[PDB]
Amino acid sequence: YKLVCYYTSWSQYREGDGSCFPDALDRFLCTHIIYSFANISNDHIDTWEWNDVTLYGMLNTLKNRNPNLKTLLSVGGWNFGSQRFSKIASNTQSRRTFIKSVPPFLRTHGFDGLDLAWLYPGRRDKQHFTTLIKEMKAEFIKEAQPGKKQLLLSAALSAGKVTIDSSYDIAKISQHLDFISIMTYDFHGAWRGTTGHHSPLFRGQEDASPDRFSNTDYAVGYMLRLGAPASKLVMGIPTFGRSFTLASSETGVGAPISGPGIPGRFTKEAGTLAYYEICDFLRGATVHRILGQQVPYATKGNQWVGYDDQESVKSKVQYLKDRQLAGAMVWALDLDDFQGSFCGQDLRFPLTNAIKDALAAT
Numbered sequence: 419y420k421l422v423c424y425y426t427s428w429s430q431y432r433e434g435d436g437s438c439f440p441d442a443l444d445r446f447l448c449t450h451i452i453y454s455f456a457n458i459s460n461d462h463i464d465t466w467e468w469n470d471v472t473l474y475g476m477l478n479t480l481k482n483r484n485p486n487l488k489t490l491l492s493v494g495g496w497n498f499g500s501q502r503f504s505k506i507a508s509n510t511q512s513r514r515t516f517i518k519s520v521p522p523f524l525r526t527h528g529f530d531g532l533d534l535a536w537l538y539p540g541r542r543d544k545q546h547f548t549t550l551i552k553e554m555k556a557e558f559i560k561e562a563q564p565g566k567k568q569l570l571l572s573a574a575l576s577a578g579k580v581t582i583d584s585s586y587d588i589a590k591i592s593q594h595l596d597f598i599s600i601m602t603y604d605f606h607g608a609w610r611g612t613t614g615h616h617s618p619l620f621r622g623q624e625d626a627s628p629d630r631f632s633n634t635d636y637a638v639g640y641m642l643r644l645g646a647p648a649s650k651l652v653m654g655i656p657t658f659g660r661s662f663t664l665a666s667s668e669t670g671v672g673a674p675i676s677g678p679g680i681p682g683r684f685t686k687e688a689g690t691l692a693y694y695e696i697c698d699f700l701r702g703a704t705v706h707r708i709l710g711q712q713v714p715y716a717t718k719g720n721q722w723v724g725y726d727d728q729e730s731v732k733s734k735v736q737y738l739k740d741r742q743l744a745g746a747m748v749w750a751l752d753l754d755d756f757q758g759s760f761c762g763q764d765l766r767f768p769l770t771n772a773i774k775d776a777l778a779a780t
């Protein structure tokens with residue numbers, strides 16, 4: 419199986435023990451590590467953080483004791499916005515310049531391939547997205563033309579049906595991508611007014627669900643139905659949780675909320691908590707497994723958070739294995755307990771290791 423793990427350039431900036439640098443990554447944990455994110459300047463792929471070059475190096479060194487470990491540079495990302503990509507992918511000159519700039523940049527910097535994270539092609543961008551993926555792949559095949567190990571091409575795709583219908587021609591792009599990472603988390607926005615798990619495996623209680631597609635099973639099944647080979651499908655498993663501030667004494671699923679949860683000490687972003695912040699939260703908290711969704715949530719005082727733990731990610735791995743998918747994608751390594759100092763044992767990367775062990779298991 420594949421175990422594609424994301425590392426974010428901005429985690430280095432986290433306070434104290436939150437600070438994560440590539441050399442803190444276990445070179446043996448994943449089969450692929452994706453560095454996020456690279457920028458696009460003047461239609462060329464470029465660096466983003468002042469010291470990316472230093473960090474790309476730390477990351478790639480990890481390949482020294484581990485020859486078959488693969489690294490990729492992801493371009494795009496949520497904040498990057500879809501505007502820049504569109505303007506590039508629709509203009510024929512911009513597309514060629516961008517495409518042409520990539521192989522040399524990855525070779526110059528030691529990367530094994532490119533990950534596209536265009537979030538998200540508009541309804542008007544569907545075709546352009548397919549064209550971008552097609553030509554980019556041509557260029558890679560053309561670059562390895564002699565005897566090079568061909569560069570890899572992947573794309574992180576939305577797990578949202580609406581988005582999937584307006585943005586992607588799944589059958590076409592699957593022909594050119596080495597693998598697709600479906601982003602199966604971030605399903606329950608706070609705008610809803612109630613508690614809900616952002617990454618449930620299944621729909622669960624029929625009348626306690628908004629719709630039938632804001633869950634992993636549906637996203638997976640749907641991509642399969644749309645023509646994505648199972649062998650090329652990597653399933654997203656989050657290592658962070660989505661939090662809410664409760665509005666009453668009710669603490670179950672669908673409980674009224676007043677807004678996103680209180681910001682975590684290290685990630686400092688309302689509505690979000692890294693697994694290691696969750697572990698701290700769990701002390702004095704009460705945990706509940708959601709019967710129909712196979713995932714837990716925790717509540718304490720006026721706070722509620724839906725996340726994944728050792729038990730739930732193993733179930734998710736069990737699920738992908740049964741569907742015969744290519745493996746799992748993890749967002750994100752720096753959100754897991756990379757220190758191994760916040761949760762139970764002194765084990766580093768508890769969630770990702772659980773995923774790894776499960777993918778190899780029995």
Ligand SMILES: CC(=O)N[C@@H]1[C@@H](O)[C@H](O[C@@H]2O[C@H](CO)[C@@H](O[C@@H]3O[C@H](CO)[C@@H](O[C@@H]4O[C@H](CO)[C@@H](O[C@@H]5O[C@H](CO)[C@@H](O[C@@H]6O[C@H](CO)[C@@H](O)[C@H](O)[C@H]6NC(C)=O)[C@H](O)[C@H]5NC(C)=O)[C@H](O)[C@H]4NC(C)=O)[C@H](O)[C@H]3NC(C)=O)[C@H](O)[C@H]2NC(C)=O)[C@@H](CO)O[C@H]1O
Nearest residue numbers: 428431495496497498535574576577578581601604605658
């Ligand atoms: C069913 C359906 O369709 N539902 C919709 C749903 O999809 C939508 O929600 C969105 O979903 C997508 C998945 O499809 C999410 O994106 C993917 O998933 C992860 C996890 O969410 C994304 O991770 C976030 O990525 C952004 C950057 O792209 C991160 O932003 C960072 O924020 C920090 C702090 O705020 C910044 O740090 C600063 O850095 C500077 C220098 O770098 C430093 O000097 C500062 O000191 C430092 N601190 C501060 C505070 O300034 C950092 O710069 C910035 N990064 C960048 C490059 O801008 C954010 O923190 C990540 N969050 C998590 C969690 O890790 C990721 O982008 C993407 N993964 C991949 C592979 O592409 C998307 O995030 C999510 N949106 C939300 C709510 O976050 C929703 C909402 O639209 O709609 C539904 O309909």
Ligand SMILES: *[C@@H]1O[C@H](CO)[C@@H](O[C@H]2O[C@H](CO)[C@@H](O)[C@H](O)[C@H]2NC(C)=O)[C@H](O)[C@H]1NC(C)=O
Nearest residue numbers: 456457458459460461462464465466467468502
């Ligand atoms: C990513 O690339 C863009 C250009 O494509 C960079 O440009 C932005 O920032 C510049 C410096 O402050 C501004 O002068 C530009 O106007 C602005 N974008 C435009 C319209 O060109 C951007 O800095 C790069 N991102 C980072 C942080 O490296």
